[PDB]
């Protein structure tokens, strides 16, 4: 019935202000197609260090997707990766920030670069991941194939590679034309 | 196209009141904060305050706090400015521009071509 | 409170030549500091935010540099266009300042 969704975004260096804004708004289209529901979402924003933007008990206090993420700041460092999925793991999905246990957990990783650190996200075995490669570091097929381990099996459907951060309007679109 | 215009200045009477208007157009007006920049005749800028679309948080410079009200319109995407107790100092031009919040606090990108406010009788 | 200060109020510079405004802070603002540039009668567009940052569009020749509580907009190779009031403000906490700016106008 109901899934608890984490987006955990990737606010490093590389992420012009204007590549940013693109990845905070598609998490808001994200939101206000799926709202009218029993989904319920929580963002956490990862590069070097690792900050819940908002948590599980303040979606269903606000709920809109734009006040949500007003007081979002651009972390402008590393891409810390692992230690992202595990902080996601471990200290997001909660039920003191307001997490249902009855939910079926899952995550959307979104990151323009190779993870930075090393280590393993055993923890988040149980948590559907989906990650999302964008674009211009992600183009040959050894940096796009170091997404896979993020990502669940068959990696052929978790994880989805943008050529552009203008194509993630499109990816939008086909998740509008799915089941 | 981001596009910020402006409107509602003009002759005001001292002890009087006056509403702007900014009309913005180009994006989606509740991803982004909104400023009220003045810059009185031939001096330097001065920042009057800050306010969110989504649910209008605001937050203001305390020298504005007292007179200057700011709100807003989601369905016009219309920023407004609600100016009271005007004085013949407040005689300056108003713009309105678009803020980036992601660095520090907050740097303007996008303004408007300003609106001039003169308080006289 | 941030009183920041620029410096001159005011210049004449050949087509060409290299600029340099300096604009100090009241107190350190770390790398935060933004640059822009109003043409009479026009609004200020942004040029440089975060201290040395080039805003997209900004042509290269407009250079920031500094941290700390002092910054320098360097504007190398002057050119006809460039003429206007530099304005400069910091963005590390409320509320925001500005700064005097600087009048530079085209010697010829």
């Known amino acids: 019935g109901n899934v608890d969704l984490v987006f955990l975004f990737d606010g490093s260096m590389s992420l012009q202000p204007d590549e940013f804004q693109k990845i905070l708004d598609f998490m808001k289209d994200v939101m206000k197609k799926l709202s009218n529901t029993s989904y319920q979402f929580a963002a956490v924003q990862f590069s070097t260090s690792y900050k819940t933007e908002f948590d599980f008990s303040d979606y269903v206090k606000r709920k809109d997707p734009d006040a949500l993420l007003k007081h979002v700041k651009h972390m402008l460092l590393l891409t810390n990766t692992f230690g992202a999925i595990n902080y996601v793991a471990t200290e997001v999905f909660r039920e003191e920030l307001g997490a249902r246990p009855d939910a079926t957990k899952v995550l959307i990783i979104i990151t323009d670069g190779e993870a930075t650190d090393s280590g393993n996200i055993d923890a988040a075995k149980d948590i559907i991941r989906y990650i999302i490669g964008i674009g211009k570091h992600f183009q040959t097929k050894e940096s796009q194939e170091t997404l896979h381990k993020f990502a669940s099996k068959p990696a052929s459907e978790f994880v989805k590679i943008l050529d552009t951060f203008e194509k993630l309007k499109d990816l939008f679109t086909e998740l509008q034309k799915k089941i | 196209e981001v596009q910020l215009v402006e409107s509602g200045g003009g002759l005001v009477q001292p002890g009087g009141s006056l509403r702007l208007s900014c009309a913005a157009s180009?994006?989606?007006?509740?991803?982004?904060?909104m400023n009220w920049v003045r810059q009185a005749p031939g001096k330097g800028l001065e920042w009057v305050g800050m306010?969110?679309?989504?649910?209008?948080?605001?937050r203001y410079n305390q020298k504005f706090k007292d007179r200057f009200t700011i709100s807003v319109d989601k369905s016009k995407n219309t920023l407004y400015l609600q100016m009271n107790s005007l004085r013949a100092e407040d005689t300056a031009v108003y713009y309105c521009?678009?803020?980036?919040?992601?660095?520090?606090?907050?740097?303007?990108?996008?303004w408007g071509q300003g609106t001039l406010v003169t308080v006289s009788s | 409170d941030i009183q920041m200060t620029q410096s001159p109020s005011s210049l004449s510079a050949s087509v060409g030549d290299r600029v340099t405004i300096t604009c100090r802070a009241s107190?350190?603002?770390?790398?935060?500091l933004a640059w822009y540039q109003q043409k009479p009668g026009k609004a200020p567009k942004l040029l440089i935010y975060?201290?040395?940052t080039l805003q997209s569009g900004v042509p290269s020749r407009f250079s920031g540099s500094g941290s700390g509580t002092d910054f320098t907009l360097t504007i190398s190779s002057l050119q006809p266009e460039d003429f206007a009031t530099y304005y400069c403000?910091?963005?590390?906490?409320?509320?925001?300042?500005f700064g005097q700016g600087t009048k530079v106008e085209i010697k010829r």
């Open positions: 521009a678009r803020g980036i919040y992601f660095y520090g606090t907050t740097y303007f990108d996008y």
């Open positions: 403000q910091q963005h590390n906490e409320y509320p925001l300042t």
């Open positions: 306010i969110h679309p989504s649910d209008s948080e605001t």
């Open positions: 107190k350190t603002i770390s790398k935060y």
């Open positions: 180009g994006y989606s007006f509740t991803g982004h904060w």
């Open positions: 975060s201290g040395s």
